[PDB]
Design a protein around this nucleic acid. Sequence first.
RNA 1: UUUAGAAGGAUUGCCGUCAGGAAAUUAGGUGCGCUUAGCAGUGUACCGCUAGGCGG
Length: 155
Amino acid sequence: MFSQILIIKPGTGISPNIIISEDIFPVLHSLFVEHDKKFGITFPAYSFDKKGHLGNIIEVLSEDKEALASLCLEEHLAEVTDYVKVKKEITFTDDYVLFKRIREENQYETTMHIKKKNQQIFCAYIKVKSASTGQSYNIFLAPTDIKHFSAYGLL
RNA sequence: UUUAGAAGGAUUGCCGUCAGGAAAUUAGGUGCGCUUAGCAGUGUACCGCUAGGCGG
């Protein structure tokens, strides 16, 4: 149950959130249906709760020290080598934080009470286009400790 | 322990009539506004499945 080092480089023009939401996260979506049992997704430095970026390093951990080679994130993310650098190592990882999919309610028309609860999630907001029908909306995150990910990489 | 303490100001009404402000003009001369910059903050927040939690 180890982890690989994926760093979104600081700077580079394009913001880190866009780079993750456009390159890395669809790759994870198309490479965790192969994984069956999702491997894991920790963003170190989720920062504070008034504000808070997902961070600058995404560490994908797994429930096995061999399955990390199976979904070989390195050389699948060689088209972002000026933006995301994949170190080649793995160290046993229970020293992380699990991440969850707080849902964020829907809009008024979708069907007052909306914004009462909508003001919590809407303050990480990694965007996802749908492999299905198509309507795109950000999925939201949180720090949680439940240990042993299911669909995208959340619990 | 206060120049202490007290107190109904009321009722009524026609301001009127009239009128020349007016004649003359020189405001002028002069002038360094400059230097610099991410519209960025993901820029958005949906499509479905009683309160609550969920496929992509």
